Symmetry: C5
Subunit: 235 residues, 5 copies
Amino acid sequence: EKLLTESGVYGTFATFQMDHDWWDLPGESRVISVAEVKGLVEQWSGKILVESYLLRGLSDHADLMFRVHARTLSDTQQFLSAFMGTRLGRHLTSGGLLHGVSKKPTYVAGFPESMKTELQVNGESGSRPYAIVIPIKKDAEFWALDQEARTALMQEHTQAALPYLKTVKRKLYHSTGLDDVDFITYFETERLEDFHNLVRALQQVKEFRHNRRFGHPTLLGTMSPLDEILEKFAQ
Amino acid sequence: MADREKLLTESGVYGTFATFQMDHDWWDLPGESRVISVAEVKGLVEQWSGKILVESYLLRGLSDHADLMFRVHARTLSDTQQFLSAFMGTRLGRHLTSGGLLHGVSKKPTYVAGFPESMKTELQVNGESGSRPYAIVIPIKKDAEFWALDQEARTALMQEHTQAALPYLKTVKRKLYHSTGLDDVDFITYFETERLEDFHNLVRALQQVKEFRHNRRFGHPTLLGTMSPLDEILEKFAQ
Amino acid sequence: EKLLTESGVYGTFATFQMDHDWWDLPGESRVISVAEVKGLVEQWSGKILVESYLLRGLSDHADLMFRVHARTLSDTQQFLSAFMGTRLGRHLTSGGLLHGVSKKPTYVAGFPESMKTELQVNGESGSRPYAIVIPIKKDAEFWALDQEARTALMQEHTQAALPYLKTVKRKLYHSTGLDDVDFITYFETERLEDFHNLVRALQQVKEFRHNRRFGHPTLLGTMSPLDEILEKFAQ
Amino acid sequence: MADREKLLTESGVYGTFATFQMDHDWWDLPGESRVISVAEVKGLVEQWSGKILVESYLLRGLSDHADLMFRVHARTLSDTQQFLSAFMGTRLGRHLTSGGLLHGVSKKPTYVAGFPESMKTELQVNGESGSRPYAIVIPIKKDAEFWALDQEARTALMQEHTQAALPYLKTVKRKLYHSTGLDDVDFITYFETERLEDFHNLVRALQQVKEFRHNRRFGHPTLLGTMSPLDEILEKFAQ
Amino acid sequence: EKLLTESGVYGTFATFQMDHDWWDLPGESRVISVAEVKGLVEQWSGKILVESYLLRGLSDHADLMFRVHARTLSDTQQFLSAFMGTRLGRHLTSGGLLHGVSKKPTYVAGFPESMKTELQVNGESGSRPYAIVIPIKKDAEFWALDQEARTALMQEHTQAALPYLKTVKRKLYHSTGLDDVDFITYFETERLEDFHNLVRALQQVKEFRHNRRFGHPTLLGTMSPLDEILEKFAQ
Ligand code: HEM
Ligand code: HEM
Ligand code: HEM
Ligand code: HEM
Ligand code: HEM
C-alpha cells in the first residue's frame, strides 16, 4: 500500500477482452479456471499490488482491466504472462497495455503556498467507484518551452481543477520511453458528471492544445473485487 | 396500469449507444434454438424496464459493419453497464461482437439564453410524430480553438448554427448528449426522421456556417439505421 | 429503368468478400446457394434496381459489389439484410457501404450555354465495361465559399473533363449525412487509360485541393450479370 | 521457343502488383496434397503464358503480412482480373488472403525530353544483369501542390530527381507505372538490385531533393522481396 | 559474433504473437513444436546471430521478438520463412518486421574531440537486461537541411545523451528504403527510469521536432534465452 503513494513505483494498465469460444466451455470448467487466477494473484500479492476493473459494458472492445503496481516491470511482466497462461487467460485477448512510473512532483514548487496547501487533498472515500484512464502525449512545442512557462501552464491547469479536488481522486504516471505516450492519467469518482465538468474546464486552458494525443482510448470502468467480475463469466 | 418514462426529456440522464454485429456461427444454430434465444433477450429487457429505458435500431444493411444498436437511458451508467454485461451474456449476446460504445449525459441548454426571444419560441419544437423513422448518430469532437473562445463568441456560433437549422425543426427530431470525459468525443448527436433527403440538406447547410470548421472529428462513424421494436429486429435473425 | 437517371432516387454501394471456409463446403450446396440469391434478386427487381460488379482480382479485400437504386433506403436495407441472410451471404464479410441520393444540378445553370449543350452528352454505349467508384469529402473551406465562387470551380472542373464525355459515363450521388463522405462518384468505361488521363486532368484544377478525402477506397471492377460472378464460387 | 513478350518495356501495357498471405490451415494439409496444389498453379500460369506475363516474388520474412507477390503484365486489366480470380480459385488460392493490390500503366516519358542531352544518354542505361535479385516496390501519391505546378516547373524537379539518381543507374533497375484513377495512388515504382545498400543510398539521396516534399504518401506499404522462379517459391509451402 | 558492432551487417527486428488455438494443442505436441524451433535456430547459428526477447506482458499484441544479424537479408529471409513454417510458426501472427543496416558514423567527425572521447563508451555489462526498440522517420525538412546544420542538431542530440552512456547500451540501424522508416534504434538497460529520463531529455532538443514518426510501435521487452521463453508455452 506504500506503492499507491510513493515514487519509483512502476504502474501498469492492462486491458483484456474475453473470447467467444469461452462460452462453449462447460460451466464448471470456467469456475475452476477462475480459481486458478484467484490463486495466482495471492501468490504474487507479496511482491506486487493488483487492482481490478470491470470495463465490460462501459469501454468498447474490453471486459476487464488490471492496474498493477511494482518496483520493477520485470515482476509485472512475469505476473501477466502467467495470468495469460491460465485456462482463463488463454481465452483472453490482450487489449491495451501501458506502463508509467510515479515520480516526485515537478512543477508544484513554483506554485503559490496557498495552492500547494489545497493539493494535499486528493479524493473522496468511496466504494465501487468509477475509474477513468486517459493516456496523453504532448506535442514537441511543449517540451521546447522553458520551465517558467510550463510551470505557469500547469498552474492554470491546477486552478481549473481545484473545485473538483474532493470528488475526484487523481494519480499521474510518467510513461515516456516505455510506450507511445508521455503520461497515463488515472481518476476515481462516484460522481461522473463532476469528472465531465472537470474535463470541460481543463479544455479551456492553454496547456490543453499541446495534447497531441488525448484519450484514444478513454477507458471507463467500475472498480470491483476480482472474483465478482469473474463470477459473471462462470454462469 | 402505465408509467412515467421521464427520461427521453429530462436532464442528468445518461444516454448510451451500443453497437453489435452478429457472428457467422449464429446461423450454425438450429432455427428453433434461435427463437428461444430471442425470448431470453425480450425477457431480460423487460426485467430491466423499471430501471432503464431501451430503444432498438436496425443497422444491418445501412451502417457499415453493424447490425444492431441500442439507445440506453439511465440515472447511472452502472445500471447501463450491468444491463449490457447481462445482455452480452445471453445466447444471443455470446454470438454478438461488441462494436461501438458511447456515453453522454443530457444537460439543460447552455447558449440558448443569449438568443433572440423569437428564436427560443421555435426551439420548443423538436419534431413531428412518426413511426418507424430513420435514425442517425454522429459523434463529434471540437478543436481546441473552440474552447479557447469566450462565451459571447461561441454563443454567436451557436446562434448561427441554430439559424441554419430552423427550416428543419419539424421534419427532424434532435437530441444532444454531453460526452466529454467518458470517451474520445465531446458530443453525441441523435436524429429521427422520415425524410432523409431533408436530413441531408440540414447537414450540408450546417457545413456552411462558421462553427463547422471547428469540428475536429465529425462522424467516423456516422451511424444510420431504422427505429423498430426489438422483437421485429430479432425475428430477422431467427430464420 | 427511370432510376438510373431520375432525382429523389437513393443509390447504394455495397461491397463484399468471400470467406475461406466457403470452399470447405461441398460443391452441391454452393450451387444451390447461388440459386437462392438469384431468386431473392428477382423478388426485389420489381421495387428496386440491382447491378453486379466483379471486383475480385481488381480491388483489394473485395470480390463482389452491388449497386442498388431505390425511392427509399428502407427498401434497400431489407434487400441487403436478406442477401446477407442467405447461405452464401452468411459466408460474406460486409465490406464497404455508402449511400447517396441523386439530385437536381446545382451549378450548371450558371455555365455558358455552349457548355450546357456539351453536357447533354453523358457517355458511350458499352457492354460489360470497367467500373470505378470514388467517394469524396470536401474540406470546410469549400463550403465556406459563396455560390459564385464554387460555381467557378465546378466550371473549371467541367472544362477539363469535356474531352472525356464520350469515353466515360458518369453519375453523381449526394452522400452527406448518411455516412462519412459528401459525394459518391461513379463511372463506366471501356477505356481505362482515358479515365486515368481524365483524373490526372482534374488533379490540376483548383477544386481538387479541397478534397480532404479522395478515394479510400478507390473501387475498380467489371460490370457483369450476377449469375456469371456466382458461377466462379460454384466450382 | 520463338516469341517476344514485348511487355516489360512497351507502353500502353498495364502492370499489376498482387500480394497474398497464406492461411494457417494451409499447413494442416498433407505434404502430398500441397505439392499437387503447386502443379495446378504452374499449369494455370502456362495456360495464360500466351496472354500475360507473370513474375513471382517471395515476400515472406522481408515484407510484413505478405508471403507472395505477383507482377502481372497485360494489354487489358480484364485479362489480369480473370487470371487472378482463377488463381484465387486454385486449391492453393483458396488458402490465400488477398493482401495489397495495385495497377498502373507504363507510359512514354513525360519530362525527359526537356533534360540536357548528356542526361538522356545515361538514362538509356537501366540496370545490370542479375539473377535472383532483390526487388522493391513503393507506391507514391503526389500532393495537390505538385499538380498545380506548370510543366516547366515539374520538368525542373524531375531533372534534380534524375541527377541525384545517376550514380546508382547501374546497380538498380527501375520501372515506373502510372496508377492514378485505378487505386488510391498516383505512381507505382519498381526496382531490382543485388545491392540493397546502394538502393538505401539511392533513396536517402532522393530524400534531399526538391521533388520529395510533394510525396504525400511514400511507401505504406514499402514491399521488399526476392525475385525467384515460381516453383521454388511454391516448394516452401509443401513442407 | 563479429556482427553486433561491425558495418555492412544487416539487422532485422521480427515480432510475433501467439494464436489462441495454440493452447488447444496437447502439451506433447507443443514440446515437440518448441524442440523443432530450438533445433532450427541452432541449425542457423553458424551463418547468423539470433537473440530473443520476451515482449509478453510488456508490449501490446506481442509475445516474442527476434533480433537477427546477417551479411545479407536473403539469409535472414530464409531463416524467418522456415521459422514461420514450423508447427509453432503456424500459430503465430507475424507482428512487426523491420530491417536496417549498420553504417559508419556520419555526423560524429564534426563533433568536439572531447565528445568523441566520451562516445567510445557504449554500456554497462548486464545479463537479462531490458530492451527497447524505437522506429524513427524524419520529416522532409530534416533532409532538406545542409550538413553543417544537421551536424549541429546531432551534436545537440549527443550532448543531452552523454549522462546516460553507461546505463544505456545503444545501436543504430539505417532502415531507409527497406520499409516505411528511416531508422531503427535499439537500447539495452537494467535501469528503466534512466531510459525514461534519457528520452524526456532528447524531447527537449531541436532534432526531436523533426521526428514525423516516433515509436509506433514502441517495443519494450526482456532479454532472455530462447528455450526459457518457449518453456512458458510448453505447459
Ligand atoms: C482534480 C483534478 C486535477 C488536479 C488538481 C491536477 C493538478 C495537477 C498538478 C498540480 C500537476 C503538476 C504535477 C507535477 O508538477 O509534476 C499536474 C500534472 C499533470 N496533469 Fe493534472 N490535475 C488534475 C486533473 C488532470 C486531468 C483530468 C488530466 C487529463 C485529462 C490531467 C493531466 C495532467 C498531465 C498530462 C500532467 C503532467 C504535465 C507535465 O508534467 O508535463 N490532470 N496536474
Ligand atoms: C434541426 C436541427 C438542429 C437544431 C434546431 C439545432 C440547434 C442547436 C442549439 C440551439 C444548440 C445549443 C444547445 C445548447 O445550449 O447546448 C445546439 C448545439 C449543438 N449542436 Fe445542433 N441543432 C440542430 C442540428 C444539429 C446537427 C444536424 C448537428 C451535427 C451533425 C448538430 C451539432 C451540435 C453540437 C455539436 C452542439 C453543441 C456544441 C457546444 O455546445 O459546444 N446540431 N444545436
Ligand atoms: C467526364 C467526366 C466528368 C464530367 C463531365 C464532370 C462534370 C461535373 C459537373 C458539370 C458537375 C456539377 C454538378 C452540378 O452543378 O450540379 C460535377 C460535380 C462533381 N464532380 Fe464531376 N465530372 C466528371 C468527372 C468527375 C471525376 C472523375 C470526379 C472525381 C474523381 C468528379 C467529382 C465531382 C464531385 C465531387 C462533384 C460535386 C461538387 C459539388 O456539387 O459541390 N467528377 N461534375
Ligand atoms: C536509378 C534510379 C532512378 C532514376 C534514374 C530516376 C529517373 C527518373 C526520370 C528520368 C523520371 C521521368 C520519367 C517521366 O518522364 O515521367 C522519373 C520519374 C519518376 N520517378 Fe524516378 N528515378 C529513379 C529512382 C526513383 C525512386 C527510387 C523513386 C521513388 C522511391 C522514384 C520516383 C519517381 C516518380 C514518382 C516519377 C514520376 C513523376 C511524374 O511523372 O510526375 N524514382 N524518374
Ligand atoms: C546514450 C544515448 C545516445 C547517444 C550517445 C546517442 C548519440 C548519437 C550520435 C553520436 C548519433 C550520430 C551518429 C551518426 O553520425 O550517424 C546519433 C544518431 C541518431 N540517434 Fe542517438 N544517441 C543516444 C540515444 C538515442 C535515443 C534514446 C534515440 C531515440 C529515441 C536516438 C535516436 C537517434 C536517431 C534517430 C539518429 C539518426 C541521425 C542521423 O544519422 O541522421 N538516439 N545518436
